[PDB]
């Protein structure tokens, strides 16, 4: 009688893109104090160059 439902693994939306976000899913130690997080192409990813 219970109902189960899972959050879908893949994204949903009109447009879906691949981006570069280092350690976006890291869980263990804090890691090196250095990251690279590009914004989605809808913004000005010019600060990274």
């Amino acid at each position: 009688m219970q109902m189960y439902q899972m959050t879908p693994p893949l994204p949903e939306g009109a447009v879906n893109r691949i981006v570069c976000m280092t350690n976006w899913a890291s869980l263990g130690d804090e890691g090196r104090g250095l990251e690279v997080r590009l914004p989605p192409p809808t913004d000005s990813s010019v600060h990274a160059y």
Binding site: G33, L34, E35, V36, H47, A48
Partner: peptide, 30 residues
Amino acid sequence: DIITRPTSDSIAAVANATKPAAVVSDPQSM
């Protein structure tokens, strides 16, 4: 945060010297 450092002063000086105005008032566009 990201790693970034100021450019050498000499380069910045010469670079800033040559920067023409992008938009100017011209009374003609025909």
